């Protein structure tokens, strides 16, 4: 819409089946935190910020309970019109210039995600890795689909090749976005 800054203080996402909820704060398009609804805890992306401000997680549980209720009401209202799938798009890029000797992070940015249920995983040399992986929450887009990012720490080498694998309902087969150092 236009401003110097945009804060979103309490994005609620609530889905069925599964009672799948997500609760977040964003500022200038970055994630301040999400509320872990099972642990009832505010999880800050920058732990530093957590020492300088706070958020009581009960604020997330309250707004999620309103989500569970509005979903009931709006689903019936629409005559149970279901969500139409989209096909998510993946891009792989390194966090900093890739130099031998220098630990680095591969980023898999996935955009056009709708609905917000997705499995993003990493392959090193065509085998699964779970060590060194972190992922963000779903970020809102102007058209109300979502984006999400995943991260794999790595030691650069001319021997290794990578894929970010994305599974989604809107896909006939998983995306494998391939990456290699030149």
């Amino acid at each position: 819409i236009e401003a110097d800054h945009v804060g979103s203080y309490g994005i609620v996402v609530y889905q069925s089946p599964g009672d799948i909820g997500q609760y977040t704060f964003e500022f200038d398009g970055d994630e301040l935190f999400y509320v872990d609804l099972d642990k009832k805890e505010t999880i800050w992306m920058l732990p530093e910020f957590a020492q300088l401000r706070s958020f009581d997680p009960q604020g997330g549980l309250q707004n999620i309970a309103t989500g569970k209720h509005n979903l009931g009401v709006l689903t019936k209202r629409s005559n149970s019109t279901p969500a139409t799938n989209e096909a998510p798009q993946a891009t792989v890029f390194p966090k900093s210039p890739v130099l031998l000797g220098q630990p680095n992070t591969l980023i898999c940015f996935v955009d056009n995600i709708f609905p917000p249920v997705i499995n993003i995983t990493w392959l090193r040399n065509s085998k699964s890795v779970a060590d060194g992986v972190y992922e963000t929450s779903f970020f809102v887009n102007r058209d109300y689909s979502f984006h999400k990012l995943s991260y794999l720490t790595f030691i650069p080498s001319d021997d290794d090749i990578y894929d970010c694998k994305v599974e989604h309902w809107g896909l006939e087969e998983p995306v494998l976005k391939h990456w290699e150092p030149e």
Partner: protein, 194 residues
């Protein structure tokens, strides 16, 4: 330390299915001008909205028609007040010491691939200027910059490619200005190879 933030309050209405609530505080020149908008969304259809510039709830589509009167009756004064109790408050009490103070200085590296690449990484906030120079004068022809790349971790990067001829005695410089820097960063590349 600091203050507890206050959420925008998601208001109660009277095969995969989704709702979303999306609140937005638009700040211009600090908290001098604030526009506040809350979006009520079913799957990806925004059906009901509050907009502070309108002053009340409006149905955006027909799915929101059953809501707009009940909301204006039931929720309006509280919602209106959120421009101050959510937007102004969160900004002044919480963003000021955290987001608005965040300053991360760019890392500037020149590599080959002939194309020189000036990689400017790990910086915050977004505002940046990155220019290629050849033997002391600004190079514009054959120069392309990416858009701002958001790393998703509270940092940005930008890559600026120069298509080049690595003649002897030719000196290339990448120059970077950012709010975190007192004066510009400059990094040199000489043929051969820096």
């Amino acid at each position: 330390r600091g203050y507890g933030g206050r959420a925008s309050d998601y208001k109660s209405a009277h095969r995969h299915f989704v709702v979303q609530f999306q609140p937005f505080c638009y700040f211009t020149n600090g908290t001098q001008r604030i526009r506040y908008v809350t979006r009520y969304i079913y799957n990806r259809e925004e059906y009901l909205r509050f907009d502070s510039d309108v002053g009340e709830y409006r149905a955006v589509t027909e799915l929101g028609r059953p809501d707009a009167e009940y909301y204006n009756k039931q929720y309006l004064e509280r919602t209106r007040a959120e421009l101050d109790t959510v937007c102004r408050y969160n900004y002044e009490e919480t963003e000021v010491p955290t987001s608005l103070r965040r300053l991360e200085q760019p890392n500037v590296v020149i590599s080959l691939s002939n194309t020189l690449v000036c990689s400017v990484t790990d910086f915050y906030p977004a505002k940046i200027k990155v220019r290629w120079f050849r033997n002391g004068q600004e190079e514009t022809v054959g120069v392309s910059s990416t858009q701002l790349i958001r790393n998703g971790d509270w940092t940005f990067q930008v890559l600026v490619m120069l298509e080049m001829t690595p003649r002897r005695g030719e000196v290339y410089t990448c120059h970077v200005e950012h709010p975190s820097l007192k004066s510009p960063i400059t990094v040199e590349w000489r043929a051969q190879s820096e």
